[PDB]
Write a protein that binds this ligand. Sequence first.
Ligand SMILES: C[C@@H](C(=O)N1CCC[C@H](C(N)=O)C1)c1noc2ccccc12
Ligand SMILES: [Zn+2]
Length: 139
Amino acid sequence: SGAIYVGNYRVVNRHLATHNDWANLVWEDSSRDLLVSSTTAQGCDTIARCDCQTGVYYCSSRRKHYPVSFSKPSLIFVEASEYYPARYQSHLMLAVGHSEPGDCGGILRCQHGVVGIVSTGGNGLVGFADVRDLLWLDE
Ligand SMILES: C[C@@H](C(=O)N1CCC[C@H](C(N)=O)C1)c1noc2ccccc12
Ligand SMILES: [Zn+2]
């Protein structure tokens, strides 16, 4: 579990979005596993605007932060689940690191700010849904 709070927006994994998230929907993309809802309170997270391939992510299954090298956002195959059929997930970045079900929503940050959130993993890998291209989150 976990979300990014920037301005009047809340960014969450689309498969974990609540009734309130869907009732206050701004944008969602099943292919990216992202959903953005509106909030009344102001969010103070800062979004990174860069091409960093190194950063630190929060791993709830270890209650720890880990430094990682991660790939550029790309289309990657993702197996079926109670949330999606087998498909390519776009804007996804992989890293070698620990992650297990329950870790989705963990933030990945670089020195510039928030890069993305945990969305996939297993087998000694962790996948992050990138948010750096969503320039509208700032305005
Ligand atoms: C269950 C599998 C997974 O990635 N899912 C389920 C949840 C939805 C994911 C998706 N993006 O479509 C696919 C998984 N394996 O290891 C992990 C580690 C972190 C996080 C999710 C996992
Ligand atoms: Zn950066």
